[PDB]
């Protein structure tokens, strides 16, 4: 398939060829044009706080070691020995000054450097240039308020610029709240879905909640519970949708601070959020203080998603076109009481973790939509994302980005897939930029 020419996503992001969820050649092409090029979530400060602390993470299909350095910085390296390519680290987290390979015993520092080679003098003499045999380093590692992302491409925009107009929406919770912590370790489950199915669902899909999660809404008694079975549509002005140049986007459901959490947490959460909002009004203004305690369903392009307030943090790790490894963490506000943090973390897993009753509602939708992408009569068919098209704005005086001033629509799908297509058809960041010079105009047409 010719990725320069093939129209996988139509103008304005209005439709996508269903094959994008099933085609293995395109999956391989995504490893290059999506995953090797863009910012990918690694870990949080709270998981590797002290020097020598490390975790392993996926970046696309590659595995990396992410290590706190002695100077307080974080560096990341391919989890592959520089000798004959054995996997260096077989655990998920720990603390070490370095890593020794179990094949021939080569010893690498936490800083990636080849520090020791067994019997180097006797065997290699002075001839092994260890300076040139450090672990393959992840070119770019940056932090967004403790959330650590990596990028293999040195040419990428800084993470802050990459978040674009999405950053303004995340800041009340990620920054002005006093900071978030990631509670580990994550749940990990393999689903038979393409990574884009859950990514698109989190970025933009409020439409499904009432029908898909009817049973979970009714059973759990959560704040969105009136939606169960499409019994009710959100009020006028119940929220909005946004999207951004580099593909990240989110829904905003005003005031939904208890999110997916069952009635056992609703009163305490609604009190806590309301109390912080009152303090924040003075600091960041009423609109942004309200955003702090409003439910944001967001995808940080390409494959990191979250529900703020619900406290859900997801990585959709790609395996092949119909296989994804789902990592599920909880996010909590640092200044919450410890007992609340613990119950919130349990509630995140309860609802959307490996046995998450909400997440179970989504499984067949994600899996079959992805697998149908392989079926012959569906490959060239069009997935529709036209809801709200021709009502989006850009450059609004209050809410930045390309914005749909309605709670339910497909604005964020359109921006996600506009960015996706611009990457798939480009060889580097310069070409993506050239392909995106009229991004918001394309999205606000008609």
């Amino acid at each position: 398939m010719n990725y320069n020419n093939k129209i996988l996503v139509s103008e304005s992001g209005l439709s996508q060829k269903h094959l994008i969820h099933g085609d293995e050649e395109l999956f391989q092409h995504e490893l290059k044009t999506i995953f090797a090029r863009n910012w990918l979530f690694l870990t949080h400060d709270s998981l590797i706080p002290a020097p020598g602390d490390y975790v392993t993470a996926k970046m696309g299909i590659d595995e990396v070691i992410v290590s706190r350095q002695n100077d307080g910085s974080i560096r990341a390296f391919l989890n592959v020995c520089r000798h004959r390519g054995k996997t260096l680290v077989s655990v998920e987290a720990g603390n070490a000054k370095g890593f020794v390979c179990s094949y021939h015993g080569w010893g690498f520092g936490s800083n990636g450097e080849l520090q020791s080679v067994p019997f180097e003098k006797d065997l290699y003499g002075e001839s092994l240039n260890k300076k040139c045999l450090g672990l393959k380093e992840v070119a770019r590692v940056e932090s967004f308020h403790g959330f650590i992302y990596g990028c293999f491409d040195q040419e990428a925009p800084p993470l802050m610029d990459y978040l674009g107009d999405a950053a303004w929406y995340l800041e009340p919770m990620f920054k002005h709240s006093g900071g978030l912590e990631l509670v580990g370790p994550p749940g990990k489950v393999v689903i038979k879905a393409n990574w884009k199915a859950p990514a698109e669902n989190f970025v933009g899909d409020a439409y499904h909640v009432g029908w898909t999660h009817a049973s979970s809404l009714r059973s759990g008694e959560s704040i969105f519970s009136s939606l169960a079975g499409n019994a009710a549509l959100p009020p006028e002005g119940a929220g909005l949708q946004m999207t951004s140049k580099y593909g990240s986007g989110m829904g905003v459901l005003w005031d939904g601070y208890s999110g997916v959490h069952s009635a056992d947490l609703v009163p305490e959460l609604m009190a806590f959020g309301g109390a912080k909002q009152e303090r924040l009004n003075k600091e960041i203004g009423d609109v942004r203080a309200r955003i702090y305690r409003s439910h944001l369903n967001c995808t940080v392009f390409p494959n990191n998603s979250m529900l703020t307030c619900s406290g859900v943090f997801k990585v959709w790790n790609p395996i092949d076109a119909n296989t994804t490894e789902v990592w599920t963490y909880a996010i909590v506000e640092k200044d919450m009481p410890e007992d609340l943090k613990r119950r919130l973390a349990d509630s995140v897993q309860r609802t959307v973790g490996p046995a998450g009753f909400w997440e179970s509602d989504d499984n067949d939708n994600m899996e079959t939509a992805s697998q149908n992408g392989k079926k012959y009569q569906s490959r060239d068919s069009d997935l529709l994302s036209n809801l709200g098209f021709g009502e989006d704005v850009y450059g609004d005086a209050v809410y930045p980005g390309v914005v749909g001033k309605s709670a339910i629509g497909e604005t964020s799908y359109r921006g996600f897939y506009r960015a996706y297509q611009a990457h798939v058809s480009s060889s580097n960041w310069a070409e993506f930029e050239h392909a995106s010079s009229t991004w918001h105009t394309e999205l606000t047409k008609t």
């Binding site: 655990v91 370790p185 489950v189 009714r218 059973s219 897993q349 309860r350 046995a355 009753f357």
Partner: protein, 192 residues
């Protein structure tokens, strides 16, 4: 068991062995076998309300953890070792049962098929609470749905059971440390 000599054995696991090696009460093992076979039958036929009513105590803690993979020699890294796949009180189990029974739980049409295999049953009365029964058992749980989806779960269960309403023994704690770190079964939405 000396865990200084048996280097691979956890303190917790060593404590549980001692519980069952001490005293053997053949009749108690038979009572436990019946209780667990009946519980498994109710769950297999998806009588989740009957399960709650007949098998689960009001003070229950129903907990399934997943433990992060750490180096056998790890001594410094100290953060949360595990997450809770399940960590449910009675009301939370009730929420899950209602979710299973909801006519708009689209995932349950066509009806799922469960088959559970319970083995290696051991039973011992608590030393201090003469009314608390410790039961250990292993489960293979087979879930089949939608023509060609088949998921098989494997686990050891550390239970505490106690006589409740009408003198019926009911589950007051189940603890499972799930053996597979990355699930390959779509989800863990089954009552182990």
């Amino acid at each position: 068991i000396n865990i200084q000599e048996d280097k691979l054995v956890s303190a917790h696991d060593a404590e549980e062995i001692l519980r069952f090696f001490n005293c053997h009460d053949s009749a108690l093992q038979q009572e436990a076998t019946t209780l667990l076979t009946q519980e498994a039958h109710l769950l297999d036929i998806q009588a989740y309300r009957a399960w709650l009513e007949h098998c689960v105590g009001s003070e229950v803690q129903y907990q399934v953890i997943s433990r992060e993979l750490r180096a056998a020699s790890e001594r410094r890294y100290k953060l949360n070792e595990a997450m809770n796949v399940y960590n449910e009180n009675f009301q939370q189990l009730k929420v899950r049962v209602e979710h299973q029974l909801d006519p708009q739980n689209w995932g349950n049409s066509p009806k799922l098929r469960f088959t559970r295999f319970i083995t290696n049953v051991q039973a011992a009365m608590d030393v201090n609470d003469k009314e608390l029964l410790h039961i250990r058992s292993n489960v293979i749980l087979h879930r089949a749905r939608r023509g060609n989806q088949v998921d098989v779960f494997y686990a050891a269960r550390e239970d505490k059971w106690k006589r409740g309403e009408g003198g019926v023994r009911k589950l007051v704690q189940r603890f499972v440390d799930y053996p597979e770190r990355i699930l390959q079964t779509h989800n863990l939405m089954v009552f182990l």
